[PDB]
Amino acid sequence: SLHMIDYKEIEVEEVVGRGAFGVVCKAKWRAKDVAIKQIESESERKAFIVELRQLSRVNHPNIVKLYGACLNPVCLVMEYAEGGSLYNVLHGAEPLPYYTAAHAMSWCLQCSQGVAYLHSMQPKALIHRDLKPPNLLLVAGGTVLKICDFGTGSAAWMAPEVFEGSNYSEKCDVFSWGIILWEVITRRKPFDEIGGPAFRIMWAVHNGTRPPLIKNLPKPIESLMTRCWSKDPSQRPSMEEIVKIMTHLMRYFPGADEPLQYPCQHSLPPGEDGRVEPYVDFAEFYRLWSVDHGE
Numbered sequence: 001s002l003h004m005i006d007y008k009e010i011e012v013e014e015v016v017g018r019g020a021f022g023v024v025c026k027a028k029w030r031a032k033d034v035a036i037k038q039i040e041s042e043s044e045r046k047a048f049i050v051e052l053r054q055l056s057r058v059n060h061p062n063i064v065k066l067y068g069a070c071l072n073p074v075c076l077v078m079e080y081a082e083g084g085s086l087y088n089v090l091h092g093a094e095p096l097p098y099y100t101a102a103h104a105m106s107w108c109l110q111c112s113q114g115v116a117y118l119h120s121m122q123p124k125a126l127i128h129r130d131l132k133p134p135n136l137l138l139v140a141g142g143t144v145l146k147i148c149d150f151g152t153g154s155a156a157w158m159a160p161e162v163f164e165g166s167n168y169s170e171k172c173d174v175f176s177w178g179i180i181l182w183e184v185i186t187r188r189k190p191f192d193e194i195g196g197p198a199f200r201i202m203w204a205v206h207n208g209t210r211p212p213l214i215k216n217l218p219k220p221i222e223s224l225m226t227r228c229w230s231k232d233p234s235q236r237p238s239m240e241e242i243v244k245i246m247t248h249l250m251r252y253f254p255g256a257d258e259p260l261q262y263p264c265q266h267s268l269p270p271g272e273d274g275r276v277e278p279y280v281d282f283a284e285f286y287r288l289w290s291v292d293h294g295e
């Protein structure tokens with residue numbers, strides 16, 4: 001429930017991308033920089049309407065803010081994520097930014113906060129259904145993360161019970177969260193070594209295949225990550241529990257407030273061993289952890 005806008009007051013600019021349906025472009029509105037997604041032929045009409053009703057209910061710090069809409073041509077006027085997508089930060093073009101373990105953990109904590117808010121909606125919970133880096137936006141110097149484009153999304157982040165058509169719950173979003181955590185820690189695309197048609201990934205994941213273990217990952221983070229990957233949905237933690245756990249771990253990950261400002265020359269040596277090395281460094285975590293415990 002909120003704000004209307006007339007297309008004639010919006011100055012469309014360069015296309016910034018295309019998601020599940022419409023097309024997102026850069027733009028201006030009332031001298032404020034905005035981002036807008038419009039339809040490209042009805043059919044997206046139905047979907048766009050659902051997005052409106054949903055987006056009109058949500059109000060949270062970690063979810064893209066909607067400014068208004070319009071059926072003149074029909075489009076959403078959202079806030080412009082200066083920082084771009086998390087996909088582009090991770091796997092984008094040449095000058096890729098350097099990021100730390102604190103950033104990675106912080107992005108994941110903020111993601112779970114936004115999703116925990118959706119899962120706690122009343123009358124009934126909203127499931128995202130399409131959690132993946134292309135749908136995670138960064139602002140405030142790549143410091144603050146926000147979720148966008150609700151499913152209502154490649155097979156690399158989908159919970160197996162979802163492809164198999166079968167019923168599913170908010171626990172499908174918890175599975176995607178687990179994969180995104182592996183992905184920001186290793187800075188590798190999940191199942192990139194499978195490729196081919198999507199059905200080859202679905203088959204692998206359906207038979208129990210998960211992203212390779214990370215070398216030297218902290219036990220408390222590894223256990224949280226693998227629990228989210230559980231075949232059995234009921235065995236995955238709730239998004240609320242993930243928020244509590246991640247919040248407590250952040251105590252050993254200081255520096256999440258620092259903006260992304262250094263360009264890194266990221267290598268990436270695959271060689272399918274029996275594990276992968278993390279992109280981020282956990283040496284400070286262990287030292288700060290050790291200080292609070294025994295080691």
Ligand SMILES: Nc1ncnc2c1ncn2[C@@H]1O[C@H](CO)[C@@H](O)[C@H]1O
Nearest residue numbers: 017018019024035078079080081085
């Ligand atoms: N508010 C926004 N600001 C900047 N880019 C956006 C926004 N919403 C969606 N996008 C872009 O939409 C493309 C298609 O969803 C994504 O790759 C993402 O970078």
